[PDB]
């Protein structure tokens, strides 16, 4: 048998709309990540998708067919049980250009990524470029490029595009990243991709002694109709543990917290609660570490957590000291051009009184620029952000031609 453990690594899946991201996650894990009504109606990813799988290797078989996602080697001709390697998970991002902020919030959770490029579309499409640039800015360097949809192009065309892709990465941080051709729809060459994931997206070193921090991307009321009172639950909060670990019965807090009134002004009250349960996928655990997206059960009234109310928050231990800032100072750099547009425009300098969008951890916040210097801006935010460490990365977006567009990045200075 294989052990039941939490996933130990998060692999982003990014790329242009309809290039095959969600189908690729299904080919690997068996799971369709889209769970929302609007996603099914429109045939598109809107919220961050998620799926897990075990990975193992059949020691008697040849590679890449030796790599498997279930405890059997019958496919490669062996009756032996495969050796368990690790459990992995996928953060399936939307490719729609209007959903870039959602992609950026998912990128904060990624240990590595697969950039999916459709073989039957011109390269590089706007969000192929834009997601590539985002990965570079955020530092998600452990990249595999997957050339998808090879089932509907000639070998000549696939090879031509392959050369284009290598030339695109030439002279960049990604010069040496592998390109793996597959068909996500017909599950062709998926074994090679799993081998690639093992070689190129290793589980990173973690630090379990650091103060526990979870970035929140989901929150739920898990109570369903037709159930007895004796199995009703308090609010559940979902996200990624980025450092340290959490345990059942631990006293925790959600930051910035709840928007309330205090002294005729808007304030955020930290939400204190206790961990009642920990789940990854369909499995319960007593503790949670980095890797995978965890569901933290609490004793909170489920009205506080319903419908992703706490998206963008962080969770820490109750006694942790974490800055919660309404005004932030950012040491910044600007991109040369707006990469996500069908036409690349030059990026104008930041000016005082501009309203910008700031991506910090899993949070997305608008704010007004109160001060501009050569490499430093100060921003008055519409809602405060939890800044759990010095020199946290922020991505800066500006509204250009009716769309939020990534224009730069920086470090939040505390
Ligand atoms: N022929 C062929 N079609 C594919 C392949 N992979 C995906 N598709 C099709 O491409 C369309 C888009 O697939 P999705 O998986 O929804 O693509 P996506 O990148 O997740 O789209 P968004 O999340 O909205 O950005 C669907 O019709 C798929 O069936 C493939 O390998 N070959
Ligand atoms: N920690 C914890 N997580 C839960 C509990 N019940 C549900 N979840 C998680 O909360 C998320 C929402 O689940 P739900 O609304 O029931 O949809 P479902 O996963 O399809 O059953 C899922 O990822 C569950 O794994 C619980 O009692 N404790
Ligand atoms: Mg679609
Ligand atoms: Mg999708």
Numbering used by the authors: 2 to 415
Mind quoting what the paper says about this structure?
In eukaryotic and archaeal cells, the initiator tRNA carrier is the e/aIF2 heterotrimer. The γ subunit forms the core of the heterotrimer and contains the GTP-binding pocket. α and β are bound to γ but do not interact together.
H97A and D19A mutants were crystallized in the same conditions as those used for wt-aIF2γ but in the presence of GTP-Mg2+. In keeping with the observed decreased rates of GTP hydrolysis, we observed that GTP was intact within the crystals grown at 4°C. In the D19A-GTP4 and H97A-GTP4 structures, GTP is tightly bound to the canonical nucleotide-binding pocket in a position similar to that of GDPNP in wt-aIF2γ. Unexpectedly in H97A-GTP4 structure, a second magnesium ion (hereafter named Mg2) is observed within the nucleotide-binding pocket. Four water molecules form the equatorial plane. One of these water molecules also interacts with oxygen atoms of the α, β and γ phosphate groups of GTP. In apical positions are the side chain of D19 and the carbonyl group of G44. No alternate conformation of D19 is observed showing that the residue is now tightly stabilized. Accordingly, the high quality electron density maps suggested that in H97A-GTP4, a very small fraction of GTP was converted into GDP-Pi.
